[PDB]
Write a protein that binds this DNA or RNA. Structure first.
Length: 849
DNA sequence: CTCTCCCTT
């Protein structure tokens, strides 16, 4: 047992703390207490019966409305706006199947529609279903909710389906995503919404009484949300006999869903695309004759294949396929030669080059942009080159989507981002390296890693379509066909890699009280060790009690659209009055950093972050300083100038602000705040006291802790609370710094790539951890009196302080348990505020003098 | 000294 620094407190401070705690100790309507008591008291049969009654709206139809839309439908079909658009709609493959789909819905509870891009299922199947019910005179009874994996798709589709109906957005077609909507009309409407939007609406409507038809789109992606939603539908539909569900899927393991729901009917709808030719490694080396120089394993895979084809390819073609570096991206110059080949031969079209990561995209850009070979110096001015990456600005400007100036060919070097989320239409040529980067979690060592891996068969098929948008294209695969045979069908289903705390808690609101029972009934059941490791977290942070049942704090956390640890952080900041700095910290972790990392500017960006941190040694606070600067830049009308100098995305910043505004309004609604404004000065009085901000950021990220012992940029020896060596990720403001006020850090996400990295970090002080943490006990180790936290970091402390801090932690826990059952803002002058001031006092003693 | 990608009445 090794001892750390002295946390003991002055007598005048300790004397005052005791004066306050004992003021609080002298203290003596809640609808929430009853609601929480009721959710625990009801069994599942009763939970069902009640939610039927409260969502009764759809048992009521408006025949005068029915008659009116049946009549305005038949009438506007003789007009000249529709009847081309009805006749151009009939050009879609789906429209041939209109009639057979309706009959399948009438005759079956769940059906499955399997179709590839362009078959029109997403745009047409909702219109198909709705227009039958308008014509049969049912129009008011019909409400269709169609879930999408991505926000962009939810809007675009809603605007497209809307232009096709000769309406503005917001009449019969509407979209709903997080913090934005054009809602369609109450009845006779199609709403496109993200899968997450629907799961939250289930808390008020767990059995879906508020829709006639559900359409899950892009279930083949195995998004976490879709797999849970299908799993819930096994529990829902038995009590929803009149409900009609349309599952919708690409042609990727389509049978899994057909199997999952009984043997339910399946429709396969033929695609619309331009044909794209597939070439593989042998086909590439045959055209360009590119030559290589600067385990096996690999020999065992390729040698069987070389024999079967030996007379289809030149012996110097087959001979090159023996090299481990011919497949994937290992030789970048090779991929450079192919782009150079496609520019010399071949028709005009854009080139899409899929490469695994940032590092590799930079490699090819620098080969293309400042080329050393003679062939490249020829082409350099004739290529218009965009890197495309989620941390790079390119996707947020119009440049990469528009076609290049005459006499130039547009060449994108991209990650997996251009596979779905971002779509470039003039791409006729796709170079698929077959390599990407993936996160993997190892339950045994509790290390998440990001490794370079081969893509799967489904990845390859989907990357091919991205060239078939405009004209017949080509897909160039840089791995052999024999390699494709060792590739998986699909990537690992998302639920199998993800932290389970947030779900397990959410299911409780739906009266699913045993997560091991439910989550096992999914298409893929998670590892049950991961559920446990998850329920064990929800017990630690006191959302579930030791028996595993929801606590009053737990019912709140499951009601907030953020992971359980930070929803609590946000609650702490309501009571401790740091709301604006904290909800910035929270929303940045839930979503993402505002900073771009454009190519070549890396050192310049670390400078902007270091200056934005204001030497606060906090990445989380660093983002908040950025938002404070952003809000002034909107006040100074300087906004664009601002985001350019600091490499910031104003699209992302507006979202963080929108999230923060949400957290405010939920807290104000839950009776934890007096104003729904996260800038309200009443709610922020403590928002400047940096030791307090670190104290809540600690209360939020605990138990993720790190310990720094070294010196020198500088060299760091730091270990996490488990003993494994870690370093600040090079993008964290804290990499390479020296001179920290404290050697202890809290972190959100730990990750191994080339080293064990902490991705973002906040320096905290021992006294703060010990208050808000757990595993606090006092004793004597040698002859030294100590105070520790988590039975790991033991600090020197004298006894008058231990007895007071330990008495302080009791009165804090008592307060929290009460504020959760009986929500109310802490009165500024009341008894509860007294305990707050006691903690503000103690934490303030760490201030930088 | 480095960064695959979605997303939550």
């Amino acid at each position: 047992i090794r001892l750390g620094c002295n946390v003991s407190a002055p007598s005048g401070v300790l004397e005052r703390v005791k004066e306050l705690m004992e003021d609080y100790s002298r203290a003596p309507d809640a609808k929430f207490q009853q609601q929480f008591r009721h959710l625990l008291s009801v069994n599942f049969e009763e939970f069902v019966a009640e939610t039927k009654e409260r969502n009764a709206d759809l048992d009521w139809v408006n025949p005068k409305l029915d008659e009116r839309l049946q009549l305005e439908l038949g009438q506007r079909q003789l007009e000249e706006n529709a009847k081309k658009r009805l006749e151009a709609r009939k050009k879609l493959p789906t429209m041939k199947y209109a009639d057979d789909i309706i009959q399948a819905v009438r005759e079956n509870q769940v059906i499955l529609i399997v179709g590839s891009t362009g078959c029109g299922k997403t745009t047409q199947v909702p219109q198909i279903l709705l227009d039958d019910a308008i014509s049969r005179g049912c129009a008011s009874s019909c409400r269709i909710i169609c879930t999408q994996p991505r926000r962009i798709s939810a809007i675009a589709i809603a605007e497209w389906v809307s232009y096709e109906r000769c309406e503005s957005l917001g009449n019969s077609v509407g979209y709903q995503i997080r913090l934005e909507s054009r809602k369609a009309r109450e009845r006779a409407s199609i709403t496109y919404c993200t899968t997450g939007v629907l799961l939250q609406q289930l808390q008020s409507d767990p059995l879906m009484h508020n829709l006639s038809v559900l359409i899950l789109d892009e279930i083949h992606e195995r998004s976490v949300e879709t797999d849970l939603l299908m799993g819930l539908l096994k529990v829902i539909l038995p009590h929803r006999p009149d409900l009609k569900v349309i599952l919708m899927s690409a042609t990727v393991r389509e049978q899994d869903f057909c199997d999952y729901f009984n043997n339910c009917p399946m429709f396969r709808i033929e695609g619309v695309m331009f044909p794209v030719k597939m070439l593989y490694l042998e086909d590439v080396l045959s055209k360009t004759n590119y030559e290589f120089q600067k385990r096996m394993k690999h020999e065992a895979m390729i040698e069987p294949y070389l024999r079967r084809i030996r007379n289809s390819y030149d012996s110097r073609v087959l001979d090159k396929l023996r090299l481990p570096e011919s497949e994937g991206c290992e030789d970048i110059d090779f991929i450079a030669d192919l782009v150079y080949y496609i520019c010399e031969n071949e028709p005009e079209g854009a080139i899409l080059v899929f490469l695994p990561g940032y590092d590799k995209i930079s490699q090819l850009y620098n080969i293309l942009d400042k080329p050393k070979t003679s062939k490249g110096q020829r082409w350099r001015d004739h290529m218009a080159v965009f890197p495309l990456h989620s941390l790079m600005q390119s996707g947020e400007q119009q440049a990469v989507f528009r076609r290049p100036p005459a006499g130039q060919r547009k060449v994108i070097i991209s990650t997996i981002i251009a596979e779905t989320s971002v779509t470039i239409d003039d791409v006729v040529y796709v170079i698929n390296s077959g390599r990407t980067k993936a996160t993997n979690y190892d339950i045994e060592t509790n290390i998440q890693s990001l490794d370079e891996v081969w893509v799967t068969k489904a990845n390859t098929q989907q990357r091919r379509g991205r060239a078939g948008r405009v004209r017949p294209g080509i897909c160039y695969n840089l791995f052999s066909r024999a390699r494709e045979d060792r590739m998986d069908d699909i990537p690992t289903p998302e639920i199998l890699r993800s932290k389970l705390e947030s779900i397990i808690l959410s299911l409780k609101l739906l009266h699913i009280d045993d997560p091991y029972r439910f989550l096992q009934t999914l298409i893929n059941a998670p590892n049950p060790e991961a559920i446990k490791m998850g329920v064990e977290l929800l017990k630690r942070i006191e959302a579930l009690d030791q028996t595993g049942t929801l606590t009053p704090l737990g019912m709140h956390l499951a009601k907030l659209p953020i992971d359980p640890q930070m929803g609590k952080m946000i609650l702490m900041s309501a009571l401790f009055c740091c709301l604006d700095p904290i909800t910035s910290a929270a929303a940045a972790l839930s979503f993402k950093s505002p900073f771009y990392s454009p190519l070549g500017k890396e050192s310049r960006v670390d400078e902007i972050k270091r200056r934005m941190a204001r030497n606060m040694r906090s990445d989380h606070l660093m983002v908040h300083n950025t938002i404070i600067a952003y809000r002034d830049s909107r006040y100074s009308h300087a906004e664009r100038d601002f985001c350019y100098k600091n490499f910031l995305s104003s699209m992302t910043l507006q979202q963080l602000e929108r999230m923060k505004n949400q957290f405010s309004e939920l807290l104000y609604n839950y009776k934890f705040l007096a104003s729904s404004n996260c800038k309200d000065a009443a709610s922020n009085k403590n928002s400047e006291k940096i030791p307090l901000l670190r104290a809540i950021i600690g209360a939020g990220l605990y138990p993720n802790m790190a310990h720094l012992r070294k010196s020198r940029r500088a060299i760091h020896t730091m270990a996490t609370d488990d003993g494994r060596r870690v370093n600040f990720h090079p993008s964290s403001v804290n990499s390479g710094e020296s001179g920290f006020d404290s050697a202890y850090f809290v972190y959100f996400q730990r990750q191994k790539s080339t080293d064990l990295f902490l991705l973002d970090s906040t320096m905290v002080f021992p006294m703060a951890l010990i208050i808000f943490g757990d595993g606090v006990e006092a004793g004597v180790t040698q002859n030294t009196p100590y105070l520790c936290v988590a039975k790991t970091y033991y600090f020197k402390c004298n006894r008058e302080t231990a007895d007071v801090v330990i008495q302080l932690r009791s009165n804090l826990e008592k307060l929290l348990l009460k504020k959760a059952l009986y929500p109310a803002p802490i009165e500024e002058n009341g008894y509860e505020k007294q305990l707050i001031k006691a903690i503000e006092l103690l934490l303030s003693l760490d201030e930088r003098l």
